């Protein structure tokens, strides 16, 4: 199917406790493949998937150089942001950046991304045109003017349409055993009485990859959106993900409820019921 590549970056200042901590990770789809942490004893970008391990020493050298440069730029940016928001030098602040690309099943660019957030709030984003900017506030407008003057969007566009797509294609081929394999969920329904009058039905999805999934309960064929407890999709630690959806049902009405599961690993969406 379609695929994505993303680089995520977080810098967190800590006045009085040294320079900001910088952590960056790279993903293809829902698979972590590279990491860098400035607080590691001798920081280097490290592999986190088997299919990237074959990249040679020069790859890791270049990647590490970029990581350290990005950490330095972020340190400058954090000092600038204090000025832009008239903030004291005493507090901890956060700068986050993501960039990357989505491609279709033919490997063609669907769209590119480059966006930044300060203290957990959107700051400035490259628009889908890869040519213009959306600034969140008057501070970000100052960045926008700077980046317009520097034609920064033009360089980002060139990367996102070129290397981002090309390297993603490479990684997909090198990781074809795993990146191009969907693992369908293993599903079951459990029943837990709460009282004489009601019981919980919990519909489980386990062992699935990628993480995108839809779990819904219906009663008499009607979606039970407001009455369904859905937990966030969560990682198992073996690449796969887990999720459940629960509804509280009147005792005796269990057969009126059906759990519906959609996942790209499933040829057709599944319908499950409690099987006593």
């Amino acid at each position: 199917g379609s695929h994505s590549m993303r680089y995520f970056h977080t810098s967190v200042s800590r006045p009085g406790r040294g320079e900001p901590r910088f952590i960056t990770v790279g993903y293809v789809d829902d698979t972590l493949f590279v990491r860098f942490d400035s607080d590691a004893a001798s920081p280097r970008e490290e592999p986190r998937a088997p299919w990237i391990e074959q990249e040679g020493p020069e790859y890791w050298d270049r990647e590490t150089q970029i990581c350290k440069a990005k950490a330095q730029t972020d340190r400058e940016s954090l000092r600038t942001l204090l000025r832009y928001y008239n903030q004291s030098e005493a507090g901890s602040h956060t700068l986050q950046n993501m960039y990357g690309c989505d491609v279709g099943p033919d490997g063609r660019l669907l769209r590119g991304y480059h966006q930044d957030a300060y203290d957990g709030k959107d700051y400035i984003a490259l628009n889908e045109d890869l040519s213009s900017w959306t600034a969140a506030d008057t501070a970000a407008q100052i960045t926008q003017r700077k980046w317009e003057a520097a034609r920064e969007a033009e360089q980002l566009r060139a990367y996102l349409e070129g290397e981002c797509v090309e390297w993603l294609r490479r990684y997909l081929e090198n990781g074809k055993e795993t990146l191009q394999r969907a693992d369908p969920p293993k599903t079951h329904v459990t029943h837990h009485p709460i009282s004489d009058h009601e019981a919980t039905l919990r519909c489980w999805a386990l062992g699935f990859y990628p993480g995108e999934i839809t779990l819904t309960w219906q009663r008499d064929g009607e979606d039970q959106t407001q009455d369904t407890e859905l937990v966030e999709t969560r990682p198992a630690g073996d690449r796969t993900f887990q999720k459940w959806a629960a509804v509280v049902v009147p005792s005796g009405e269990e057969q009126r409820y059906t759990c519906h599961v959609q996942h790209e690993g499933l040829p057709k969406p599944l319908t499950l019921r409690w099987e006593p």
Partner: peptide, 9 residues
């Protein structure tokens, strides 16, 4: 692989 260029805020 990562991009080579960036600009501070």
């Amino acid at each position: 692989r990562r991009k080579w260029r960036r600009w501070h805020l």
